[PDB]
Write a protein that binds this ligand. Structure first.
Ligand SMILES: [Mg+2]
Ligand SMILES: [Mg+2]
Ligand SMILES: [Mg+2]
Ligand SMILES: [Mg+2]
Ligand SMILES: [Mg+2]
Ligand SMILES: [Mg+2]
Ligand SMILES: [Mg+2]
Ligand SMILES: [Mg+2]
Ligand SMILES: [Mg+2]
Ligand SMILES: [Mg+2]
Ligand SMILES: [Mg+2]
Ligand SMILES: [Mg+2]
Ligand SMILES: [Mg+2]
Ligand SMILES: [Mg+2]
Ligand SMILES: [Mg+2]
Ligand SMILES: [Mg+2]
Ligand SMILES: [Mg+2]
Ligand SMILES: [Mg+2]
Ligand SMILES: [Mg+2]
Ligand SMILES: [Zn+2]
Lengths: 52, 191, 136
RNA sequence: CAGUCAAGCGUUCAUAGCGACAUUGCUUUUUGAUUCUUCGAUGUCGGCUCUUCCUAUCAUACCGAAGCAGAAUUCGGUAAGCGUUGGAUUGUUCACCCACUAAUAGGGAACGUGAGCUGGGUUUAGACCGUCGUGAGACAGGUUAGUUUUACCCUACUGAU
RNA sequence: GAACUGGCGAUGCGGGAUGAACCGAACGUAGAGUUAAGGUGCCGGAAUACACGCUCAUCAGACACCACAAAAGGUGUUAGUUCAUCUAGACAGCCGGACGGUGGCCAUGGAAGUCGGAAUCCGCUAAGGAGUGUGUAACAACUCACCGGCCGAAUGAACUAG
């Protein structure tokens, strides 16, 4: 359908991220602190929820 | 803690020539010449043996010292970019609607045309930064190559067309359509 | 206008504010129509919603057979009786206000139309046009 | 009105969305407590008209997250630029339904605004009923009728020499 | 609403921009000098004096009474505390191997380590587990955890307060 070789390439920019638990910011997958001033550069993070 | 001395090293290849005034750097290489400004960091420069340039900060703080290594990488990319060049291969991702990407020149601007993205009737035009070469390279399906001397223009323009193809009002985790960078390398890689 | 609005119409002078009683022009057995609202109308302080020719309205039957009483239903105005200016340049008006009963989709409850109908209303609701006798 | 912790709910899973047991705060659009100013009087409810301001944003603009396939929806951010209605009943503020709309968000300005209006209520004097009192009379119990004064001064504002 | 003292009322004066209560100090009319509390960028008289550090705020902070902010957080930055690892090559980053004794002994439909379960010692080398995960119903097959290859000097964990 979409030749899943590209999905990993495509998901790495859209799905393979991490989310700040306070300001819902989109972060790199291996981030330790959120890069946003309002949330106080908090360390509380969650992975971006995947399909299925 | 005011490190009284900090030093990082700038190796100079054979064929290049480096001209550095106060904070205006001029690198001359086979593929061209690249320059920019650095007057916003207050660093010193030292020529050693025509093949090695030294950069130092005296009595620098944590942030000040960290800025030095940024320049070390930054000017190095000029040297790499002027000897080997910069090549950014760029891949399409489409599920149902093939994306028609062409090159148009209105007023000689050499625009990049995007069509049929999610079946949209809108056409998205991305200007080509000067010094960046566009290649509808064959033998690999649905890929474009951007090449140039300065990594900044090559990288930013590559990112520019990436951002112009975002998807709105839909689940990006499902609608993976777009154009995404697949390979960052050198024009004269493996040389 | 609304769900059954097939196309757009130019603005025409409003002549039917809410609370007006309007003649029923079909064979559904209703005698008059009481306006309580107008579809697509805006909002403003103290501005009474007003109906015009071809506008779907929320109407109520005040005279007719009992099964049509005591309940609200959509309606479409087919005669205005207030002069309005067509963009061809003419001012025209009927002698009385008239309308029909229709579902929210615009399917008319009745089967026949008595008297003439306005061209704007007929051009906009296809179902009203079919049962219309004379259109002007 | 908003946080902090996290036993659980959520098919599995604390934190998509909720969240007990606790605990920290904010506001003065509620009601309280006090009597500091006013009893040689600052015209008390409500409605009508009108202007501006606050944001704790209902919608519209742009985004982030999901137990976001789509549509619909929910949580959140920047955001007060623009808009937030017509009616039945009640004096009502409040309340409840009908209907349209993108939505029918919440508040302040001496609980905005009576030399701007009205006087429906409260809140003089007339009168009726119920309960209470022997009685005169009492009732945030019910009902009906009951005078709304002045700007030519200064400033403010809109215009005008 | 009570106790002791000091104040205002009855009180001016310098300071707290402004104030009955605060700080300094209580008053005849004048002249000179020195100070109090308070200040010395300009308004404003007086050092843009000297010295050691901290802080960059896309709501900084700026002086008691006094005109406010907390719980909880922050590889922002600074200084510390306690643990460990390290040239017998520390952490990273990149590369390879990761073997035999013995598939240790049950669950036998199947367990070298991996649906599980009482267990658990050796030989080879600088190094590799009677095994960490991916994997097979098992086995290998990948991987780790350990060392080796490069690298050449500090690295990690927890906590405290400015
Ligand atoms: Mg009104
Ligand atoms: Mg009082
Ligand atoms: Mg009084
Ligand atoms: Mg008086
Ligand atoms: Mg007055
Ligand atoms: Mg806000
Ligand atoms: Mg108030
Ligand atoms: Mg008002
Ligand atoms: Mg007044
Ligand atoms: Mg009376
Ligand atoms: Mg009497
Ligand atoms: Mg009696
Ligand atoms: Mg009374
Ligand atoms: Mg006295
Ligand atoms: Mg005194
Ligand atoms: Mg003292
Ligand atoms: Mg001076
Ligand atoms: Mg703290
Ligand atoms: Mg700190
Ligand atoms: Zn954040």
């Amino acid at each position: 359908i979409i030749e899943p070789s590209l999905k990993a390439l495509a998901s790495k920019y859209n799905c393979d991220k991490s989310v700040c638990r306070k300001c819902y910011a989109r972060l790199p997958p291996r981030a330790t602190n959120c890069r946003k001033r309002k949330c106080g550069h908090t360390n509380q993070l969650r992975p971006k929820k995947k399909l299925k | 803690m005011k490190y009284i001395q900090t030093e990082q090293q700038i190796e100079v290849p054979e064929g290049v020539t480096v001209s550095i005034k106060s904070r205006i750097v001029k690198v001359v290489g086979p593929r061209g010449t690249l320059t920019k400004n650095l007057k916003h960091i207050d660093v010193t420069f030292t020529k050693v043996n025509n093949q090695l340039i030294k950069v130092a900060v005296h009595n620098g703080g944590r942030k000040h010292v960290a800025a030095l290594r940024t320049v070390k990488s930054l000017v190095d990319n000029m040297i790499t970019g002027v000897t080997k060049g910069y090549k950014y291969k760029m891949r399409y991702v489409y599920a149902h609607f093939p994306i028609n990407v062409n090159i148009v020149e209105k007023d000689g601007a050499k625009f990049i045309e995007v069509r049929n993205f999610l079946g949209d009737k809108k056409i998205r035009n991305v200007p080509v930064r000067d010094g960046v070469t566009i290649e509808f390279s064959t033998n690999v399906k649905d890929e474009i190559v951007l090449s140039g001397n300065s990594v900044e223009d090559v990288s930013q323009n590559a990112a520019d067309l990436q951002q112009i193809c975002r998807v709105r009002n839909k689940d990006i985790r499902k609608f993976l359509d777009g154009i995404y960078v697949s390979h960052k390398g050198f024009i004269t890689e493996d040389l | 206008s609304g769900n059954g609005a097939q196309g757009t119409k130019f603005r025409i002078s409003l002549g039917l504010p809410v609370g007006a009683i309007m003649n029923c022009a079909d064979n559904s057995g209703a005698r008059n129509l009481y306006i309580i609202a107008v579809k697509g109308s805006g909002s403003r302080l103290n501005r009474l919603p007003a109906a015009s020719l071809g506008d779907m309205v929320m109407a109520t039957v005040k005279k007719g057979k009992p099964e049509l009483r005591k309940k609200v239903m959509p309606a479409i105005v087919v005669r205005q009786a207030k002069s309005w200016r067509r963009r061809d340049g003419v001012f025209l008006y009927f002698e009385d206000n008239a309308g029909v009963i229709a579902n929210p989709k615009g399917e008319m409850k009745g089967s026949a139309i008595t008297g003439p109908v306005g061209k704007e209303c007929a051009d906009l609701w296809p179902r009203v046009a079919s049962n219309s006798g004379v259109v002007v």
